[PDB]
Amino acid sequence: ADQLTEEQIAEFKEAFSLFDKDGDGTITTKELGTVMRSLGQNPTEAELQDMINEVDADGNGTIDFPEFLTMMARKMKDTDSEEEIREAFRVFDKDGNGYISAAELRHVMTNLGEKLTDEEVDEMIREADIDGDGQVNYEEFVQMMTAK
Ligand SMILES: [Ca+2]
Ligand SMILES: [Ca+2]
Ligand SMILES: [Ca+2]
Ligand SMILES: [Ca+2]
């Protein structure tokens, strides 16, 4: 961690300032769990504890400024899954431009083994479609997947 002087410390700081809700310099299930669920992880106590202990080095329990830096490194790959989902997005996108229209997706759904109508699909679009242009782009699609 020699190549992480004030230069890096400042950067990582922000990533460690948002998590630390209490405002002391540590992170716990309460904090980490407050941001982790924001993305769509909703990790259980056992999960948070395991992640906290894994990074916990000092030997106290709650992640610190230095220890945290360790997670931000491993947690960077944990999200990699993003791609694993991309593939799916492609399938739906027939034309292959970026936005998944109602018709494009509508057809896909059928393949599964059912017969849906503009109405049925409409209810779906209003789910992922954020802006409301009758489309479901990558971003809009991702949210849906991680939306309960
Ligand atoms: Ca804290
Ligand atoms: Ca710690
Ligand atoms: Ca499309
Ligand atoms: Ca859209």
UniProtKB/Swiss-Prot annotation:
Gene Ontology CC, one term: myosin II complex
SUPFAM superfamilies xref list: EF-hand
Residues involved in Ca(2+) 4 binding: D129, D131, D133, Q135, E140
InterPro entries: CALM/Myosin/TropC-like, EF-hand-dom_pair, EF_Hand_1_Ca_BS, EF_hand_dom
Residues noted as binding Ca(2+) 2 in the record, renumbered to the chain: D56, D58, N60, T62, E67
PTM-bearing positions, type N-acetylalanine: A1
Claim: Transmembrane helix is one of the keywords in the record: no
Binding site for Ca(2+) 1: D20, D22, D24, T26, E31
Binding, Ca(2+) 3: D93, D95, N97, Y99, E104
CDD domains named in the record: EFh
An annotated Gene Ontology molecular function: signaling receptor binding
Modified residues (N6,N6,N6-trimethyllysine): K115
Domain EF-hand: 7-42, 43-78, 80-115, 116-148
Protein task: Calmodulin acts as part of a calcium signal transduction pathway by mediating the control of a large number of enzymes, ion channels, aquaporins and other proteins through calcium-binding. Calcium-binding is required for the activation of calmodulin. Among the enzymes to be stimulated by the calmodulin-calcium complex are a number of protein kinases, such as myosin light-chain kinases and calmodulin-dependent protein kinase type II (CaMK2), and phosphatases.
UniProt similarity note: Belongs to the calmodulin family.
Protein name, per record: Calmodulin-1
Source organism per UniProt: Xenopus laevis
